[PDB]
């Protein structure tokens, strides 16, 4: 088949869905029992069975899909915060690069789903690897999703104006990236510099 601009936007949107589920699971944002094991990208992953969250993510993912297609979304951020104070403790950032020319493409692009799938699987393994060094979240936390766009006027009303919600004193490590040939997704996670080691 190959890669079209719409095919790519679906891949990426869907990646974010699985990416978010894995963060919320691995970081204990929702209890581990509100998650279920499924097969995706050739491995076993955890996705929510919480009905509100399912609905919420379906809505986000459908919107990202639309924005990615139009090259209207540059950053997707998962902000993890102390439920009491609102202090940001951990902040996962995805940067999205777009080939705006892919709209002019007369053929799907040559990259095997397998190839893309190997890339995504590598990125997800990496996300899993973070449990082994991320500072413990030692208070109860919630999450929030932010996006960054250049096209502000066409953002649906349901999306509220926001700050970037940076951590004051942070450490950040770069994760692997993947590419469809049309969208490239860079990842990283930042977190508050620990009190002591």
Partner 1 sequence: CMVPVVFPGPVQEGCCQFTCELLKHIMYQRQQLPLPYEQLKHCQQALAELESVLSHLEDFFARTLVPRVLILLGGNALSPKEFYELDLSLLAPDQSLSTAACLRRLFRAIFMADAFSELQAPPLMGTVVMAQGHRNCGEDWFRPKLNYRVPSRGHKLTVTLSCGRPSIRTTAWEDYIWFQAPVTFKGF
Partner 2 sequence: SWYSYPPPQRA
Site residues for partner 2 per CB under 8 A? 52-53, 55-56, 59-60, 63, 142-149, 152, 155, 158-164
Binding residues with partner 1: total (CB under 8 A): 23
Q: How far is the CB of 133 from partner 1 (least distance, A)?
A: 4
Q: How far is the CB of 147 from partner 2 (least distance, A)?
A: 6
> Tokens 């139009």 map to which residue?
70
Q: Pick one of 22, 81, 102, 119: the residue that binds partner 1 (CB under 8 A).
A: 119
Burial of 107 (0-12, 13-18, 19+ CB in 10 A): exposed
Instruction: Please tell me the distance from the alpha carbon of residue 114 to that of residue 111, in angstroms, as a whole number.
Output: 8
What radius of gyration do the chain's Cα atoms show? 17
Distances (CA, A) of 158 to 20, 23, 155: 20, 24, 8
The smaller minimum CB distance to partner 2, of residues 49 and 162, is found at 162
Give the interface with partner 1 as residue ranges (CB under 8 A).
Answer: 37, 42-44, 115, 118-119, 121-122, 125-126, 128-135, 173, 176, 196-197
């Amino acid at each position: 088949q190959g890669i079209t601009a719409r095919g790519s936007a679906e891949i990426v949107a869907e990646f974010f869905s699985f990416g978010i589920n894995s963060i919320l699971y691995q970081r204990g944002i929702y209890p581990s029992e509100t998650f279920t094991r499924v097969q995706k990208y050739g491995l076993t992953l955890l996705v929510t069975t919480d009905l509100e969250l399912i609905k919420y993510l379906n809505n986000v993912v459908e919107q990202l899909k639309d924005w990615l297609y139009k090259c209207s979304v540059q950053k997707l951020v998962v902000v993890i915060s102390n439920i009491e104070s609102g202090e940001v403790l951990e902040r996962w950032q995805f940067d999205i690069e777009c080939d705006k020319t892919a709209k002019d493409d007369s053929a799907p692009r040559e990259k095997s789903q397998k190839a893309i799938q190997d890339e995504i699987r590598s990125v997800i393994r990496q996300i899993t690897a973070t449990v082994t060094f991320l500072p413990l979240l030692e208070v109860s936390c919630s999450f929030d999703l932010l996006i960054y766009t250049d096209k502000d006027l066409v953002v649906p009303e349901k999306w509220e104006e926001s700050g970037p919600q940076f951590i004051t004193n942070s450490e950040e490590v770069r994760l692997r990236s993947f590419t469809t040939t049309i969208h490239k997704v860079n990842s990283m996670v930042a977190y508050k510099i620990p009190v002591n080691d």
